[PDB]
């Protein structure tokens, strides 16, 4: 794909400032887009937007199609008198998922009662129309969530057999018996996509394109795995016989075991990869470009025996990436995908990536731990510049935090390299800005930076720490923290690098 020479910012919606414990798709989101436009930015990147479970991770959703109910702005509903909102004492600059869980779900249920009581016939018909439209995934999702409250939050593969194996009868009775709870979940979905649709229109009016994110593998306990067990490696009991992960490296002698269920690609191939065509169809309705996590998994993936706690006993299994993307290109006539090609990737992966003109990634935090041959250093970027450069991703520490823990060699080499590119700095707080400048001077078409670096915040603002048991996906901006001055700095930098 032909990307214009520009820049953008990375910011998950939950991180937006505002009342009631979590960023939502409302005024503050619109204010952020306005800020981005004022700063001359043309891209906004977010993480997966579906419903989360234990861990609060956007990469382990109960559904690959649903929207996250925690992102719904309740104020518009409160204005129509559907609900009353109170602040139980939400913390500052961070999401407390426990309080959020305890307060938002009851509020959403309350709003639905208000709706069924005061909603106008128009709204009621719009809601009904929405349900008929998204039926292909919404019926399974809503019933899925409803059945969870009927079975103590148990995963689907632990529900009674009739429900687990989706016997037509059991499902008919369930929907009828839980009809009001099922309508509740579809209601949360209706408000989500409605509010995201309005926000997307606002971005487009401001000349901003949204970069979405989707994990290559879905979660084990999700509506789509429950409704299509045939597409995954499960046993007759609905349990994964194998799970996703990566082989042992110079870092993790045990490798990584993510636990995600694996696709039966052969089965998917015969069905024209319908599941994936649907994932892309939905993504294209929410974003302008979509990045796919662990992209190498389309060429080959590490298969791990589900019984094992580690990854040491796995094996590489080839996947039909070439056929999949040929299909994607057929249906959509374009592959608006950004490949997350970090880590160990082979020439086969590169060929698949460049074959469909998919942009790769470059992370500056990883460019100074070696020599000048480091592929993350700007002078080694491909001539066509079809890549996106970041200071750091959502999985890395903020750039300031990274610098404070960096090795003397990385720090000295980074200082010399920058100087070689005409960039200079005096204090640590300026390192994030120095690196953003380096990325903007590069040949990379897009430079996207996490808001934490624009603010030059430390490790306390890290979004996700792979391995750390808690405190992830919680950071939030404070009201007014992102000032117009910050915007003017970004604008001037973009202006000096032909990215305006």
DSSP 8-state secondary structure symbol assigned to residue 57: -
Q: Whole-angstrom Cα distance, residue 256 to residue 259?
A: 9
- The smaller minimum CB distance to Hg ion, of residues 360 and 487, is found at 360
Say how many C-beta atoms besides its own lie within 10 A of residue 94's C-beta: 17
DSSP 8-state secondary structure symbol assigned to residue 486: H
Q: Which residue is nearest to Cl ion (CB)?
A: 395
The binding track of 43-72 with respect to Cl ion, each residue x by CB under 5 A or -, is ------------------------------
The binding track of 247-286 with respect to Hg ion, each residue x by CB under 5 A or -, is ----------------------------------------
Q: Whole-angstrom Cα distance, residue 425 to residue 100?
A: 41
Judged by CB under 5 A, the number of residues near Hg ion is: 1
Q: Whole-angstrom Cα distance, residue 284 to residue 264?
A: 24
202 contact, one of Hg ion, Cl ion, none, CB 5-8 Å limit per kind: none
Measured between alpha carbons, how far apart are the two ends of the chain, in Å? 20
The binding track of 378-417 with respect to Cl ion, each residue x by CB under 5 A or -, is -----------------x----------------------
- The smaller minimum CB distance to Cl ion, of residues 214 and 358, is found at 214
Burial profile 322-340: b = 16 or more Cβ within 10 angstroms, e = fewer? eebbebbeeeeeebbbbbb
- The smaller minimum CB distance to Cl ion, of residues 139 and 395, is found at 395
Query: Are residues 225 and 156 in contact, defined by beta-carbon separation less than 8 angstroms?
Result: yes
Footprint on residues 6-35 left by Cl ion (CB under 5 A): none
350 contact, one of Cl ion, Hg ion, none, CB 5-8 Å limit per kind: none
The three-class DSSP label of residue 8 is strand
Burial profile 9-34: b = 16 or more Cβ within 10 angstroms, e = fewer? bbbbbbbbbbebbbbbbbebbbebbe
CB of 62 to Cl ion, least distance (A): 17
- The smaller minimum CB distance to Cl ion, of residues 60 and 442, is found at 60
CB of 395 to Cl ion, least distance (A): 5
Secondary structure percentages of the chain, helix, strand, coil, to 5: 45, 15, 40
What is the helix (H) or strand (E) element at residue 305, kind and residue range? Answer: strand 300-305
- The smaller minimum CB distance to Cl ion, of residues 214 and 477, is found at 214
Residues identified as active-site: 293, 340, 395
- Which region among 1-9, 97-105, 293-301, 476-484 touches Hg ion (by CB under 5 A)? 293-301
CB of 368 to Cl ion, least distance (A): 23
Query: Are residues 16 and 476 in contact, defined by beta-carbon separation less than 8 angstroms?
Result: yes
CB of 426 to Cl ion, least distance (A): 33
Q: Which residue is nearest to Hg ion (CB)?
A: 293
Quickly list DSSP for 239-265: -BSEEEEE---SS-TT-EEEEEE-B-H
- The smaller minimum CB distance to Hg ion, of residues 381 and 473, is found at 473
Residue 427 structure tokens: 């204090």
Q: Whole-angstrom Cα distance, residue 392 to residue 62?
A: 27
DSSP H helices in 346-430: 347-355, 399-405, 408-420
- The smaller minimum CB distance to Cl ion, of residues 68 and 157, is found at 68
- Which region among 81-89, 192-200, 259-267, 291-299 touches Hg ion (by CB under 5 A)? 291-299
Q: Whole-angstrom Cα distance, residue 22 to residue 477?
A: 10
- The smaller minimum CB distance to Hg ion, of residues 119 and 363, is found at 363
CB of 255 to Hg ion, least distance (A): 14
460 contact, one of Hg ion, Cl ion, none, CB 5-8 Å limit per kind: none
DSSP 8-state secondary structure symbol assigned to residue 477: P
CB of 158 to Hg ion, least distance (A): 26
Q: Calculate the CA 164 to chain-centre distance.
A: 28
CB of 342 to Cl ion, least distance (A): 10
CB of 387 to Hg ion, least distance (A): 19
The three-class DSSP label of residue 267 is helix
Which residues sit at the interface with Cl ion, rule CB under 5 A?
A: 395
Which residues sit at the interface with Hg ion, rule CB under 5 A?
A: 293
């Amino acid at each position: 794909m032909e990307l214009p020479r520009a820049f953008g910012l990375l910011l998950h919606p939950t991180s937006l400032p505002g009342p009631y414990g979590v960023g939502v798709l409302g005024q503050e989101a619109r204010d952020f887009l306005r800020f981005l436009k004022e700063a001359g930015g043309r891209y906004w990147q977010v993480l997966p937007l579906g419903p989360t479970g234990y861990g609060d991770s956007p990469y382990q959703s109960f559904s690959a199609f649903a929207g996250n109910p925690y992102l719904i702005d309740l104020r518009p509903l409160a204005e129509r008198g559907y609900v009353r909102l109170e602040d139980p004492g939400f913390p500052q600059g961070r999401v407390d998922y426990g309080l959020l869980y305890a307060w938002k779900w009851p509020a959403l249920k309350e709003a639905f009662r208000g709706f069924k009581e005061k909603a106008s016939p128009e709204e009621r018909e719009a809601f009904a129309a929405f349900r008929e439209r998204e039926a292909w995934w919404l019926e399974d999702y809503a019933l899925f969530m409803a059945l969870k409250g009927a079975h103590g939050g148990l995963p689907w593969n632990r529900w009674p057999l009739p429900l687990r194996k989706r016997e037509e009868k059991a499902l008919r009775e369930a929907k009828s018996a839980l009809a009001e709870e099922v309508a509740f979940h579809a209601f949360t979905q209706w408000l989500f996509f409605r509010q995201w649709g309005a926000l997307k229109a606002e971005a487009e009016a401001l000349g901003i394109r949204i970069i979405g994110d989707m994990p290559i593998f879905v979660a084990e306990d999700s509506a789509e795995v429950w409704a299509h067990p045939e597409w995954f490696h499960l046993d007759e009991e609905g349990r994964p016989t194998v799970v996703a992960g990566v082989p042992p490296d110079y870092f993790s002698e045990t490798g990584q075991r993510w636990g995600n269920p694996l696709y039966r690609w052969d089965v998917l191939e015969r069905e024209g990869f319908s599941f994936w065509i649907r994932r892309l169809e939905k993504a294209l309705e929410l974003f302008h470009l979509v990045r796919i996590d662990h992209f190498r998994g389309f060429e080959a993936y590490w298969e791990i025996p589900a019984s094992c706690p580690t990854a040491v006993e796995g094996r590489w299994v080839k996947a039909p990436g070439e056929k999949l993307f040929q299909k994607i290109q057929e249906v959509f006539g374009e592959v608006p995908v950004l490949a997350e090609d970090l880590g160990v990737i082979t020439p086969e992966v590169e060929a698949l990536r460049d074959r469909f003109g998919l942009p790769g990634m470059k992370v500056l935090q990883f460019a100074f731990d070696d020599g000048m041959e480091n592929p993350f250093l700007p002078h080694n970027y491909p001539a066509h510049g079809r890549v996106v450069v970041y200071t750091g991703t959502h999985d890395n520490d903020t750039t300031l935090g990274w610098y404070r823990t960096a090795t003397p060699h990385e720090k000295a080499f980074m200082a010399r390299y920058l100087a070689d590119w005409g960039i200079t700095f005096r204090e640590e707080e300026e390192v994030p800005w120095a690196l953003m400048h380096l990325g903007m001077k590069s040949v990379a078409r897009l430079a996207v930076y996490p808001v934490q670096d624009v603010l030059a915040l430390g490790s306390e603002a890290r979004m996700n720490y792979p391995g750390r048991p808690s405190g992830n996906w919680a950071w939030r901006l404070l009201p007014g923290e992102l000032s117009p001055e910050h915007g003017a700095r970004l604008r001037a930098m973009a202006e000096a690098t032909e990215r305006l």
